[PDB]
């Protein structure tokens, strides 16, 4: 970092979240006063305090606040900001914003308008790519309009051909065909949804590429022409067409293909005349047939892992490029330094549809910054609020080591020492992803989540040894709580006669089985017998700290007692997964055997609202005999469109919702039968 | 649980929009030891919250207003609930911590015909006769005579603090501070650290009152 | 002034000093803290007197003529008279006619009300406290009478309520007059707040003397014994 290098003194970040904080910290590192914009809701965000000055925009929704042209222009002209930075999304590809700013005397940090317009269109992108002499996805070179042309193409290229129309900003019209029969009825269907959604009906049918891995190449460009490629980035793990886990030095990729990818990306950037930082996306399959997917003109979300492996700062380099100074690095200077893995901690429940976002307020938040080799990019703090107007994200966790195994181990350690109370995160799913056997080996594809968990996310399957360790830890915590409860102060009027029990016989109900445990205490060491198996658990037994470290049989395990009840219920986080355990004494369990269970009328026939947002599409009416998997309502929330199905067969008793109605979580929408 | 633990999550829990409500149970959970709270009558007269908790290991009684339900207005049932809890806590030497966000009493003909005057006077009485240590934190709102009810100094409230969003009025905390109605304006993140300290000082509080067989509480 | 006294007499009411004169024995009223300015007068007349030869402390509110709101001086005078009554062990009788107080506000009014509430709670069980509401009382002024031992009202002239009919109409959206919201009949027949209602001021004061004859002066004294025939 060179503060002497002159750069725009006043910079406005036209974004929000962790990226705004990252930009603010980078400008502060290079010594630049930074102003930040925020809506009414985000007035208490981290980035507004991290910025030296603030300019409130207006209303809560991002459409009228972070997409408002007039408001942002007012902010620019009132704060006299010398530079603007969009981060990613929002106004990343806003070409009218680019031209209106160019009408003024404020510099935009990012791609030029011409490149954005050229690369935005999928047809134009494919055309320019095939003029650029870069291998592209095999398929029909044109637009199919009738079933006859579709079946002819499927015959003369390949039966597994995607039926994909144009537009598709949210992935709409992205259906796939696999045989001649599909290429006619599915062709009609896809034309129907294309007409319903956008209607341009410009198809881009192309051959399916099996078992691919989405690879990202960081192309750094400038106004001086020369472009540099920065290693690679594997982003194969994807749920619902969204990146979740990214490792930069891709294991499958080898040096010859590294050079090939770098040369292809640089040549394509020169053809596009890119003058900023972007990522080239490749779909190399098991046959090493690389196919250019698309090149994002904005800064990639998962850039910090590339920064970690390369020992470089992309934000500073791109802001220097925007200043006017040429690129100051060479391909020889670029290398690999160990390994690094990054995950996106989102505010979503991974059990429902591989991530169903929730809403809430962070009552407790702690990052494992003290753990070695851990970097946290987060735009929230204790007391922050998750809202329906923005992306359901909590943080980004990046761990770097001298080897892939070391990075994975440090990432597991960081995930086990990360405290989030107030919302439902998805740390569990990330944990099984980074400890999965296939992921550790390297065999990963874009359909990783689809086939590894066919039915969906179930949780961490406990081994017998791990189950014994969990039961021992729970029993030890229970006995520790009782022992602390026995400790009073001296009364001198009615002295306390402390009970002298030596063994605790407990019944622990994990999942469905019931286990008999015998726990004995000796100083700070608990001897626990679970079904005969003997274990020794030793720890400091601090009952107020959120994180508790135990030493079960030498094996060090960090656990979190999320909740505890006087009735014996205990919700405890083991290895990233929350387990419910009911601990009773033996006498209490014997007497509880006589308690009558309360019958719950869980006969379905109802449908709640897991998505807190606005129901924008209702496809049912009172009296509709729906079936299994039939979509009921679509709710826009978290700036994400999610469609939910009934999952069973039953006539609709009544509908308590309408298309475009604000509905929170837990609201009964459609009654069923 | 260290007694100096900061609670930064409380710095932005009170919204600026006076019409918008929040949950006082979140504040109570954040402040008390280990976030453990034995709520008494959790499902009755939910516009007031009473319960037992611990501060630095010592049993404390918690009284607070709930702006989520009925905007925190006091009525007959909440008055009776709070009065009984406060009287019990005073009778057995248990310190009281109060969180005040009351905008006044609930208006209407049903309340007047039900005897809102005497039922409110019950809570006034209960807070006034207490001789145990009393700590008061005004979070946002203290309209009307209800402000006097939550032991506003003159009802022997030992130490009183206001958040920088407290808006003590009749129909900003500066009037209250100038007149002497708060001992300080505290940052919401230091609340716990303050309260514990006060409970150490006031543990030896002793008050002398005129002799009587008993008092005539407006039952 | 004289015009305000005539206006008060037109409604059928008395002023504070005539009320005190009727209540107490002739030539037995001793005013205290006469010279305090809220304008002097403070809209409350405090002092001590005798009923049938027995000591009593009294205050009478005078908001209808020369009082603006519940200044600190008003509550300070009331608190002083209550402290004297505690010190010597004699009852307190309070005539409440707070028909005024600007727009029912005042930053220093609520603090004075809190002080008076504290005095009432301290005196509860130590000395008898009687409250006679002789005019409209609203807001936080209605809790001190509720904290006293006995509460009496004057018919068709006195009211007790926390919020006026205007706020009830604004919020609950219902139409009720002052009488049906806080009148004497409402508080003596279906509210349980007042203990008795009297025809007018003279009748109320005479009945208050008769009632006062029954009570002891403090809780350190035995029950009174008159002469039996
Ligand atoms: N031809 C293809 N064959 C198979 N999968 C594809 C193909 N094109 C895209 N995908 C899948 O979709 C992902 C990217 O989709 P695409 O870029 O078209 O989506 P989008 O909605 O336009 O936005 P975004 O760029 O944010 O993903 C890829 O990572 C891959 O999983
Ligand atoms: Mg892409």
**Bridge partners, residue A396, by sequence:** A344, A377
Shortest-distance ligand to the CA of residue A446: 1
Q: How far is the CA of C78 from the centre of ligand 1 (A)?
A: 81
Of C105, C118, C168, the CB nearest to B171: C105
Catalytic residue selected from A74, A149, A246, A294? A294
If we measure between CA atoms, which residue out of C73, C80, C74, C70 comes closest to residue C48? Answer: C80
CA atoms of A146 and B211, how far apart (whole Å)? 101
Helices B116-129 and B76-91, packing angle to 10 deg: 20
Here the tokens at position A23 are 């930009």
If we measure between CA atoms, which residue out of B88, B100, B99, B96 comes closest to residue B60? Answer: B96
Chains with at least 3 CB pairs less than 8 angstroms from chain B: A, C
Which atom of ligand 1 lies at the shortest distance from residue A214's CA? 29
Tell me how crowded residue C26 is: count the other CB atoms within 10 A of its CB.
8
Q: How far is the CA of A216 from the centre of ligand 1 (A)?
A: 13
A382/B33 CB distance under 8 A: no
Q: Which three-class secondary structure state does DSSP give residue A282? A: strand
What is the Rg, in whole angstroms, of the alpha carbon atoms belonging to chain B? 16
**Where does ligand 1 bind, in terms of residues with CB under 6 Å?**
A 137, 162, 168-171, 206, 209, 214, 238, 241, 293-294, 446
In a mutagenesis test of the C interface, which of B105, B168, B216, B217 is the best target, namely the one with the most C β-carbons within 10 Å? B216
Interface of A with B in 531-550 (CB under 8 A): 543-544
CA atoms of C130 and C120, how far apart (whole Å)? 11
List C-alpha distances in Å: A216 to A184, A250, A279, C14, C141: 35, 9, 6, 93, 74
C160/B213 CB distance under 8 A: no
Interface of B with A in 28-47 (CB under 8 A): 29-30, 33-34
- DSSP state letters, B22-50: --HHHHHHHHSGGG--EEESTTSSTTEEE
Q: How far is the CA of A214 from the centre of ligand 1 (A)?
A: 9
A362/B9 CB distance under 8 A: yes
Q: Is A511 left (phi over 0), alpha (psi -120 to 50) or beta?
A: left
Nearest CA in chain B to A542: B1
List C-alpha distances in Å: C227 to C56, C207, C209, C214, C224: 21, 20, 17, 13, 10
Alpha helices in A163-313 (DSSP H): 182-197, 255-272, 303-310
Classify burial at C173, counting beta carbons within 10 Å of its beta carbon; exposed 0-12, middle 13-18, buried 19 or more: exposed
Here the tokens at position A427 are 């740390």
CA atoms of A229 and C27, how far apart (whole Å)? 108
Q: Is A532 left (phi over 0), alpha (psi -120 to 50) or beta?
A: left
CA atoms of A8 and A320, how far apart (whole Å)? 9
Here the tokens at position C63 are 């908001």
Is B73's Cβ below 8 Å from some Cβ in C?
Answer: no
Q: Which three-class secondary structure state does DSSP give residue A473? A: helix
Q: Quickly tell me which residue has 């709101």 as its tokens.
A: C69
**Bridge partners, residue A556, by sequence:** A551
Interface of B with A in 7-26 (CB under 8 A): 8-13, 26
Q: What is the DSSP letter of B74?
A: B
Shortest-distance ligand to the CA of residue A93: 1
Nearest CA in chain A to B7: A382
- For chain B, the residue count is 219
Q: Which three-class secondary structure state does DSSP give residue C56? A: strand
* A294 catalytic residue (yes or no): yes
In a mutagenesis test of the A interface, which of B4, B9, B10, B13 is the best target, namely the one with the most A β-carbons within 10 Å? B9
Classify burial at B140, counting beta carbons within 10 Å of its beta carbon; exposed 0-12, middle 13-18, buried 19 or more: buried
Q: Taking CB atoms and an 8 Å cutoff, what residues of chain B touch A543?
A: 34
If we measure between CA atoms, which residue out of B114, B172, B150 comes closest to residue B24? Answer: B150
- The CA distance from C40 to the nearest CA of chain B, in Å, is 23
Helices A404-416 and A427-435, packing angle to 10 deg: 150
Q: Which three-class secondary structure state does DSSP give residue A358? A: coil
Shortest-distance ligand to the CA of residue A214: 1
Q: Quickly tell me which residue has 């006469």 as its tokens.
A: C34
Nearest CA in chain B to C163: B107
- The CA distance from B186 to the nearest CA of chain A, in Å, is 18
Of A363, A543, A544, the CB nearest to B9: A363
Is B4's Cβ below 8 Å from some Cβ in A?
Answer: no
Long-range contact set of residues A662-666: C-beta below 8 Å, sequence gap at least 24: A662/A613, A662/A614, A663/A609, A663/A612, A663/A613, A663/A614, A663/A615, A663/A635, A664/A359, A664/A609, A664/A612, A665/A358, A665/A359, A665/A609, A665/A610, A665/A611, A665/A612, A666/A608, A666/A609
Q: What is the DSSP letter of A325?
A: P
**Bridge partners, residue B65, by sequence:** B48
Q: Taking CB atoms and an 8 Å cutoff, what residues of chain B touch A363?
A: 9, 26, 29-30
B8/A544 CB distance under 8 A: no
- Are C75 and C36 in contact, with CB atoms under 8 Å apart? no
Q: Is C207 left (phi over 0), alpha (psi -120 to 50) or beta?
A: alpha
Is B10's Cβ below 8 Å from some Cβ in C?
Answer: no
CA atoms of A226 and A275, how far apart (whole Å)? 9
Element (H, E) at A219: strand A213-220
Which atom of ligand 1 lies at the shortest distance from residue A281's CA? 29
What is the Rg, in whole angstroms, of the alpha carbon atoms belonging to chain C? 17
Q: How far is the CA of A501 from the centre of ligand 2 (A)?
A: 64
Q: How far is the CA of A456 from the centre of ligand 1 (A)?
A: 21
CA atoms of B125 and B102, how far apart (whole Å)? 17
Tell me how crowded residue C53 is: count the other CB atoms within 10 A of its CB.
7
CA atoms of C74 and C62, how far apart (whole Å)? 10
Residue A151 CB contacts under 8 Å (≥ 6 apart), including other chains: A180, A183, A184
Method used to determine the 3D structure = cryo-EM
CA atoms of A467 and A574, how far apart (whole Å)? 10
Q: How far is the CA of A272 from the centre of ligand 2 (A)?
A: 16
Q: What is the DSSP letter of C226?
A: -
- Are A221 and A280 in contact, with CB atoms under 8 Å apart? no
CA atoms of A468 and A535, how far apart (whole Å)? 8
**Bridge partners, residue A228, by sequence:** A220
Residue list, annotated binding site of A for biotin: 354
If we measure between CA atoms, which residue out of A540, A532, A533, A544 comes closest to residue A556? Answer: A540
Q: Mutate which of A92, A171, A391, A450 to test ligand 1's pocket (most atoms within 8 Å of Cβ)? A: A171
Q: Mutate which of A279, A293, A391, A639 to test ligand 1's pocket (most atoms within 8 Å of Cβ)? A: A293
CA atoms of A603 and A326, how far apart (whole Å)? 68
Q: Taking CB atoms and an 8 Å cutoff, what residues of chain A touch B188?
A: none
Residue A254 CB contacts under 8 Å (≥ 6 apart), including other chains: none
If we measure between CA atoms, which residue out of B117, B123, B120 comes closest to residue C182? Answer: B117
Of B108, B124, B181, the CB nearest to C143: B124
Residue A130 CB contacts under 8 Å (≥ 6 apart), including other chains: A136
Of B1, B12, B34, the CB nearest to A383: B12
Q: Quickly tell me which residue has 């009170």 as its tokens.
A: B14
CA atoms of B151 and C115, how far apart (whole Å)? 11
Which atom of ligand 1 lies at the shortest distance from residue A294's CA? 17
Q: What is the DSSP letter of C62?
A: -
List C-alpha distances in Å: A96 to A102, A103, A649, B143, C72: 10, 10, 49, 51, 65
- Are A12 and A37 in contact, with CB atoms under 8 Å apart? yes
Residue A4 CB contacts under 8 Å (≥ 6 apart), including other chains: none
Nearest CA in chain B to C220: B212
Is B112's Cβ below 8 Å from some Cβ in C?
Answer: yes
Mark whether B and C touch (3+ CB pairs within 8 Å): yes
In a mutagenesis test of the B interface, which of C90, C193, C223 is the best target, namely the one with the most B β-carbons within 10 Å? C193
User: After which residues is the backbone of chain B broken at C–N > 2.5 Å?
Assistant: 171
CA atoms of A476 and A581, how far apart (whole Å)? 13
CA atoms of A327 and A309, how far apart (whole Å)? 19
If we measure between CA atoms, which residue out of A55, A52, A32, A31 comes closest to residue A43? Answer: A55
Q: Taking CB atoms and an 8 Å cutoff, what residues of chain B touch C150?
A: none
| Resolution (Å units) | 2.7
Of C110, C168, C191, the CB nearest to B147: C110
- For chain C, the residue count is 229
What is the Rg, in whole angstroms, of the alpha carbon atoms belonging to chain A? 28
Q: How many beta-carbon pairs under 8 angstroms link B with C?
A: 128
CA atoms of A400 and A251, how far apart (whole Å)? 15
CA atoms of B188 and B68, how far apart (whole Å)? 20
Q: How far is the CA of A241 from the centre of ligand 1 (A)?
A: 6
């Amino acid at each position: 970092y060179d503060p002497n290098e002159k750069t725009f003194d006043k910079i406005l970040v036209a974004n929000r979240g962790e990226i705004a904080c990252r930009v603010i910290r980078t400008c502060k590192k290079m010594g630049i006063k930074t102003v930040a914009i925020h809506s009414d809701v985000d007035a208490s965000s981290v980035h507004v305090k991290m910025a030296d000055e603030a300019v409130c925009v207006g209303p809560a929704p991002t459409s009228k606040s972070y997409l408002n042209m007039d408001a942002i222009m007012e902010a620019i002209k009132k704060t006299r900001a010398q530079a603007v930075h969009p981060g990613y999304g929002f106004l990343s590809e806003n070409k009218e914003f680019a031209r209106c700013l160019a009408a003024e005397d404020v510099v935009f940090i990012g791609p030029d308008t011409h490149a954005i317009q050229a690369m935005g269109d999928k047809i134009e992108s494919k055309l320019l790519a095939k003029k650029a002499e870069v291998n592209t996805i095999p398929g029909f070179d044109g637009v199919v309009k009738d079933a006859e042309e579709a079946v002819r193409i499927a015959r003369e290229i390949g039966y597994p051909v995607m039926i994909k129309a144009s537009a598709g900003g949210g992935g709409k019209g992205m259906r796939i065909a696999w045989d001649d029969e599909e290429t006619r009825d599915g062709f009609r269907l896809s034309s129907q949804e294309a007409a319903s959604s956008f209607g341009d009906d410009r198809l881009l049918i192309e051959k399916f590429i099996d078992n691919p891995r989405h690879i990202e190449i960081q192309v750094l460009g400038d106004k001086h022409g020369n472009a540099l490629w920065l290693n690679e980035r594997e982003c194969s793990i994807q749920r619902r067409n969204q990146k979740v886990v990214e490792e930069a030095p891709s294991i499958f990729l080898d040096a010859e293909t590294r050079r090939a990818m770098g040369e292809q990306a640089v040549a394509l950037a020169r053809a596009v005349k890119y003058s900023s930082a972007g990522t080239v996306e490749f779909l190399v399959d098991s046959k090493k047939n690389f196919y250019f997917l698309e090149m994002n003109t904005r800064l990639q979300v998962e850039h910090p892992v590339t920064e970690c492996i390369t020992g470089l700062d992309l934000v500073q380099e791109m802001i220097r490029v925007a200043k006017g100074y040429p690129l100051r690095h060479k391909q020889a200077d670029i290398r690999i330094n160990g390994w690094a893995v990054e995950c996106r901690v989102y505010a979503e429940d991974p059990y429902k549809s591989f991530g169903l976002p929730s809403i809430g307020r962070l009552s407790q938040y702690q990052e494992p910054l003290h753990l070695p080799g851990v970097r946290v990019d987060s735009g929230i703090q204790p007391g922050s609020d998750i809202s329906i107007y923005y992306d359901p994200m909590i943080s980004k966790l990046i761990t770097y080591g001298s080897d892939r195994t070391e990075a994975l181990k440090r990432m597991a350690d960081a995930l086990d020492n990360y405290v989030i109370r107030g919302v439902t995160h998805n740390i569990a799913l990330l944990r099984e992803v980074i400890i999965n056997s296939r992921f550790v080996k390297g065999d990963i594809s874009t359909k990783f989540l689809s086939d590894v968990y066919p039915d969906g996310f179930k949780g961490h399957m406990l081994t017998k040894s791990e189950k014994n360790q969990l039961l021992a830890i729970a029993s030890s915590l229970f006995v520790a709580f009782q022992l602390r409860a026995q400790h009073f102060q001296e009364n001198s009027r009615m002295p306390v006669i402390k009970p002298d029990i030596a063994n605790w016989e407990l019944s622990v109900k994990l999942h469905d089985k019931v286990h008999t445990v015998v726990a004995s205490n000796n100083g700070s060491v608990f001897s626990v017998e679970v079904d005969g198996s003997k274990l020794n658990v030793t720890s400091t037994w601090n009952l107020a700290s959120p994180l508790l470290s135990v030493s079960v049989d030498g094996t060090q395990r960090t656990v979190q007692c999320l909740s505890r009840e006087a009735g014996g219920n205990m919700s405890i986080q083991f290895l990233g997964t929350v387990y419910k355990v009911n601990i009773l004494t033996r006498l209490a369990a014997e007497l509880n055997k006589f308690m009558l269970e309360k019958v719950t009328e869980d006969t379905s026939s109802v449908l709640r609202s897991p998505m807190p947002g606005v129901v924008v599409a209702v496809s049912v009416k009172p009296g509709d005999a729906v079936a299994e998997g039939q979509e009921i309502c679509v709710i826009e929330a978290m700036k994400m469109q999610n469609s939910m199905t009934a999952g069973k067969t039953g006539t609709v008793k009544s509908v308590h919702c309408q298309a475009g109605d604000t509905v929170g979580e837990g609201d009964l929408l459609v009654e069923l039968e | 649980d260290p007694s100096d633990r900061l609670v930064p999550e409380l710095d932005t829990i009170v919204p600026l929009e006076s019409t918008k409500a929040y949950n006082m149970v979140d504040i109570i959970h954040s402040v008390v030891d280990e976030r453990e709270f034995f709520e008494i009558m959790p499902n009755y007269a939910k516009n007031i919250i009473v319960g037992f908790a611990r501060m630095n290991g010592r049993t404390v009684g918690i009284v607070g207003n709930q702006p989520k339900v009925a905007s925190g207005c006091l009525d007959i049932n909440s008055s009776v609930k709070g009065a009984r809890f406060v009287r019990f806590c005073d009778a057995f030497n248990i310190p009281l911590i109060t969180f005040v966000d009351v905008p006044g009493f609930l208006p209407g003909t049903a309340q007047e015909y039900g005897g809102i005057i005497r039922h409110g006077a019950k809570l006034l009485y209960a807070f006034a006769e207490a001789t145990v240590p009393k700590v008061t934190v005004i979070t946002r709102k203290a309209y009307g005579g209800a402000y006097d009810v939550m032991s506003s100094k003159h009802l022997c409230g030992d130490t009183n603090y206001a958040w920088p969003t407290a808006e003590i009025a009749v129909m900003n905390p500066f009037p209250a501070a100038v007149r002497g109605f708060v001992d300080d304006i505290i940052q919401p993140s230091s609340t716990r650290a303050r309260i514990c300290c006060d409970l150490d000082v006031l543990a030896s509080k002793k008050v002398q009152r005129p002799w009587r067989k008993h008092a005539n509480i407006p039952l | 002034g004289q015009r305000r006294i005539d206006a008060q007499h037109k409604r059928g009411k008395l002023t504070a000093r005539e009320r005190i004169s009727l209540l107490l024995d002739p030539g037995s009223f001793v005013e205290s803290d006469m010279f305090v300015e809220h304008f002097p007068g403070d809209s409350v007349v405090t002092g001590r007197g005798r009923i049938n030869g027995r000591l009593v402390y009294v205050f009478s509110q005078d908001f209808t003529v020369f009082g603006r709101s519940l200044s600190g001086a008003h509550a300070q005078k009331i608190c002083k008279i209550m402290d004297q009554a505690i010190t010597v062990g004699a009852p307190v009788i309070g005539l409440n006619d707070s028909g005024g107080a600007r727009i029912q506000e005042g930053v220093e009014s609520l603090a004075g009300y809190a002080d008076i509430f504290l005095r009432n709670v301290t005196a509860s069980g130590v000395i008898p406290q009687i409250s006679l509401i002789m005019g409209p009382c609203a807001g936080g002024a209605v809790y001190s009478p509720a904290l006293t031992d006995f509460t009496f009202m004057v018919k068709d002239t006195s009211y007790l309520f926390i919020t006026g009919p205007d706020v009830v109409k604004s919020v609950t959206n219902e139409d009720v007059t002052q009488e049906e919201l806080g009148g004497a009949k409402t508080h003596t027949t279906m509210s349980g707040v007042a203990h008795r209602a009297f025809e007018n001021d003279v009748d109320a004061l005479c009945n208050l003397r008769d009632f006062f004859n029954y009570l002891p002066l403090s809780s350190q004294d035995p029950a009174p014994v008159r002469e039996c025939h």
